[PDB]
Amino acid sequence: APAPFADFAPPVRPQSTLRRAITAAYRRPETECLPPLVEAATQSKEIRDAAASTARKLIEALRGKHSGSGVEGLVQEYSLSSQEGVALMCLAEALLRIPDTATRDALIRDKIADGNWKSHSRSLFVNAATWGLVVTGKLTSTVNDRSLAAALTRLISRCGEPVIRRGVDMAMRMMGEQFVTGETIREALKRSKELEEKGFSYSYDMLGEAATTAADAERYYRDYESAIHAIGKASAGRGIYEGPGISIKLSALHPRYSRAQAARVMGELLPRVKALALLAKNYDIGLNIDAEEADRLELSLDLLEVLCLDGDLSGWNGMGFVVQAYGKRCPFVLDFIIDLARRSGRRIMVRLVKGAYWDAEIKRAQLDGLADFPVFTRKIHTDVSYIACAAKLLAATDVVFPQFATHNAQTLAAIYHMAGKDFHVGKYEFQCLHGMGEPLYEEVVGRGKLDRPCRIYAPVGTHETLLAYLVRRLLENGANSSFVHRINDPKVSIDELIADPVEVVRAMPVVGAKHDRIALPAELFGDARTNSAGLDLSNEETLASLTEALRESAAMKWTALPQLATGPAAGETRTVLNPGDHRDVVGSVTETSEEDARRAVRLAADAAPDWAAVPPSERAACLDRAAELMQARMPTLLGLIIREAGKSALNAIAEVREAIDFLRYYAEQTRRTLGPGHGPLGPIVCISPWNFPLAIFTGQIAAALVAGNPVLAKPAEETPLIAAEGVRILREAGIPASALQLLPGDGRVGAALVAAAETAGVMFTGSTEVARLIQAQLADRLSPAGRPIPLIAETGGQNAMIVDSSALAEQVVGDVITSAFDSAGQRCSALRVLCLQEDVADRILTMLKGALHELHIGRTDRLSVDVGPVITSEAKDNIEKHIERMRGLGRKVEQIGLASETGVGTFVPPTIIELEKLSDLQREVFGPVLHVIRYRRDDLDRLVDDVNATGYGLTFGLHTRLDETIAHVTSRIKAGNLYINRNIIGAVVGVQPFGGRGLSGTGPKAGGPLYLGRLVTTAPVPPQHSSVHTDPVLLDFAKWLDGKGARAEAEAARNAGSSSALGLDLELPGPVGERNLYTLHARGRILLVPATESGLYHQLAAALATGNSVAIDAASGLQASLKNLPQTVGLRVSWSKDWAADGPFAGALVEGDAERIRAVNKAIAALPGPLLLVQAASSGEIARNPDAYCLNWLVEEVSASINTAAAGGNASLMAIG
Amino acid sequence: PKAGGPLYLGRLVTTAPVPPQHSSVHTDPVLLDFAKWLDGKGARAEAEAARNAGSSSALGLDLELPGPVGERNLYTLHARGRILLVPATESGLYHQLAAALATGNSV
Amino acid sequence: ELMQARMPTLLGLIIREAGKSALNAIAEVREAIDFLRYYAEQTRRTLGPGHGPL
């Protein structure tokens, strides 16, 4: 048996001093990075004056020949609005998908120009965000396809065939000659002769990146290989400086290019790069490795090292490598490369760029809760870094070949004068992007200008392949801080453009301060609370320290005991085994007798006043202290979760982060709300699931505790050890032993706790079937006041994602792989049903199956493991029984092979099952099993019906670029957590408050602002909880009441209309590149069980004020109290003689004495389907208490998370520099 | 239609143009249910007409118009109310219903 | 353009023929000018050969 974590994440090679200095700078504070760069970038006053003069001269020439763009002239000629211009370019794009020129022209002349363009599976406007950048310079993340359709109809009906003709010719020019140098390498090489004769050179980019499958990587490989032949044939011995070369992206050459898969990268990717480099060597052309995301930088250095030390490549100086000056590690990376060039004797071609992925790096660091960014946050810092690194490169031209890739004339001029008077071809060069840089460098290349060479980075590919690179390009030119945007801005003077970034930074009061408008990840929530911190699993120091802490966690003797108020109790003891390897004993659990569980409830009851008397601020301080303890102990907590619950390190980090976030969120919500009149319920039984064994465990207990309730904590029988450690942490944080008792054991302990007479409330997260048993237990019970015992029951999902033909397959597949198979599908939020529009289903399914087979399944104490085990052999048997049933029905089943090592544990391979109809599913299958259905676009509304028809309502995803489809689907889906253009497993506390409806939950949502109010007898007013909107049917009912003479009830109805928070619509603070929305909706149809006329009027007012319809108990005999209702109200009112037939309901209001309430509660619990959140009151309570029925529980919370960076960049961050 | 607004000129020609900014991303939910019902009955041309009406309807348009500072001048498209339908044929009635339901109206 | 340039004279007629004050006569002429320019622009944004007159 392998020792735990003995092979967790060993580095590719021992880290040299130079490599370690790189890693040390990864997230260095910005104020520490800049001073050395300012020193390195300093030049003499004479040079700065000469540079400014050169830069002014370049900028004056640039602005002098600056003519209007072709699209701008087209917009002008036909008086097009922006939407018309965008719609026209979308139409032209589509017409160019028609290959035959004569066929296209007939369609234009005879069909398109004559009105109905719509007549002639894929929205015309799928790429409108890109064309929007071209036309307007601004990025709109999604497409208003109804606005574009209207604009296209309007412009065609107004201007006819001539404007279509001009649009097509424009689009043809741009997509064939401006965004790419050519469609094919042969075409690009032909078009390169003109500028080569003027002194330019070329580096061709075949536009591959981010392989998703093995087949993708093979395709990109043979594309590079075939391009190298064509370029090498064309080079014809010109060599690596005068002649053309190629650029490659490592992400194109392997589907798992990541530090987590470093062994696969070195074993499988490296030989492919070597083979391409050997061919480049034989033709003697340059081969450049493009720089990509920050978490790939250091990994790529291991390939660069091996290649430069490989004797088979000796004699060739064409190996090239990009370094990104916006990165804090850039100068240290250059030190490493220069030293490698010295050791290997290879004159490495070093392309210095600023960096292409800035927005994405900001979002990723925020999402991951890391200490700082790996890039600068002020644009001028990148400029100083660039010039500092150019000085380092220019001092090493004997050993490297510097290549200064920039379109900034100030940057260029500074380096031109820095390099001095001695020049020869091969000393260094400049570089520019095809299309973007020729105006500037025609003022540089040639003995009549600055007589310095420029290599053009030349994209090559079809219209289809060009999109990703294009948005990344167009977003760059649109940012306010970009040189290209500023030189075109008339309000920007040449003096401002030639301003020296080195001197500007040097004179700042605080050198190198972070941007004021970009939050560090820790500060995402500002003054409200401190964000939890994650760990960077791409950082070798982190991996090394985590390796030791994980190993140490595996040597600990973890135990879980019945921790009663009086001290640990005796019981039956057994071992806890690693689900991924039953030979790995993780610890020992002593489980609770039903006698001791009943005793613990009595002890909690006796201790309840002492805990309620701890002021809310001090209870919240305990939570905050507990959060600090968990943050400090995260590495050890990771190791325990990894081994006890079969989680990967990434998932365990998120798990501990979520626990920390619960603690801090409920602490802050407490400080915002709880006062003397919000009395605790009493002893609360917290029953938690195995699959989030720390986070949900902690969240329920922390909420109950901070609301002033003593807690009986019953963890899932599978995962008691992490629960015991969380209880130890909470107790260390100051929660008294009498306020928090741990009762390990199975459902018998849970049931004994629920049944205990003093149990005042139950918080349950788990399966719907178990919640239903607890609901039945509680229906026997009333509080001492004669009211139902509150139950929060957060249960299963049957979560769908709908994908239309506008979505990007690579994005979809990544989000599907994560949503369906992360944690082996053992997330309640996990994707269960993928719904694919028929026209794209085959392509996406092929890509999905290819991605499936790149997953590594195994024991999770290895960083390379993607998917761990299922929790037990019983879970495995249950999942496999489902798979084989489906397989028996003839459904296509895709499964990846499991290594023999999995036999010592309980594993189910990630599985894809292709279904015919959504009704082929019957129950939640809690494992790594994705079902796929196809749908025709016209049946989208029916498909949403089908998703809703399961009765679940937890998470839901939609991948589309089209606003009409977003509006349609999100208005018709009924689920508590929605996700647009991203995965569906985000439940960030306070950002996506988490929890569903129907069979998925009673609410209120964990991690949201209504949660604590359920755990006290009188609910406070949550922060931000109000609405200016009044339900109109409530208003009509209040008027009807006044017309009937029921004046007091009409007043109560109007008060309910005002007090309702129906229509609340908020955006919650969170990471950049995401919009996180929180809204209060009607729950649905509320069952009303009245006893008196006034009671019925109050119940109806409460239900209508919160947007609901009602079914009124016909056995009340109160039909005559509701005669002659307004039609608006009658539409919402039905009478029910058979409650079971008229559901599902979404809640209930009950009026009666205590035994009437108990009887109705039993009848309601017997209704099929969803657990109902029931509120009961006596007639006298209704008369005395306007809040007898609390409106908090008559609305439904909906969280929506929209990935606004999905189009390829972040519009908000484009204005930040 | 309103004088001084974008629907006005279209009343004075035999085929109305699409006015500037005249669109909506919202689809009437009753229109959607009607299209599905027509689908179920096999009235494929009418169901297509219903879907097309649902998309081209500008019901729900909600714009701020340019004007003076210190004012917000808003322009919105709502249902008219109850529309009198005088059909002659079943297909005609389905088409009338599609047009009226797509624009939020009762009939 | 003509109504704008002749607004003072048009004001005088409106004041005496229709009982308007100077301020309201100014508003009257401005609105006429705005109708003219608005329907002109709306025409430039929309009308094509298939939008036949009544």
Ligand SMILES: [C]C1=C([C])[C]=C2C(=[C]1)N([C][C]([O])[C]([O])[C]([O])[C]OP([O])(=O)OP([O])(=O)O[C][C]1O[C](N3[C]=NC4=C3N=[C]N=C4[N])[C]([O])[C]1[O])C1=NC(=O)[N]C(=O)C1=N2[C]1[C][N][C](C([O])=O)S1
């Ligand atoms: C020219 C070139 C070549 C030849 C090649 C390459 C490149 C380039 N790239 C790109 C770069 O990086 C950049 O992005 C551009 O170029 C731009 O820059 P320039 O011209 O310099 O401009 P300016 O304006 O001066 O600047 C801009 C910049 O800055 C920065 N920022 C912004 N904002 C900010 C910043 N920082 C800080 N903070 C703040 N706030 C940024 O950076 C921007 O951009 C590249 N890149 C990369 O990454 N890599 C590579 O490799 C490269 N190359 C190419 C290839 N790839 C790419 C793609 O694909 O896309 S391109």
Ligand SMILES: NC(=O)c1ccc[n+]([C@@H]2O[C@H](COP(=O)([O-])OP(=O)(O)OC[C@H]3O[C@@H](n4cnc5c(N)ncnc54)[C@H](O)[C@@H]3O)[C@@H](O)[C@H]2O)c1
């Ligand atoms: N809605 C959410 O937020 C959410 C979150 C996580 C998990 N879940 C659901 O949880 C399920 C998986 O977790 P699980 O396997 O641990 O759920 P489970 O229903 O099997 O058990 C959950 C807890 O209930 C206890 N239990 C079992 N029988 C009981 C009884 N008769 N009375 C009282 N307690 C009893 C168990 O000991 C455990 O502590 C999945 O259905 C998943 O969807 C929901």
Ligand SMILES: [Mg+2]
């Ligand atoms: Mg269970």
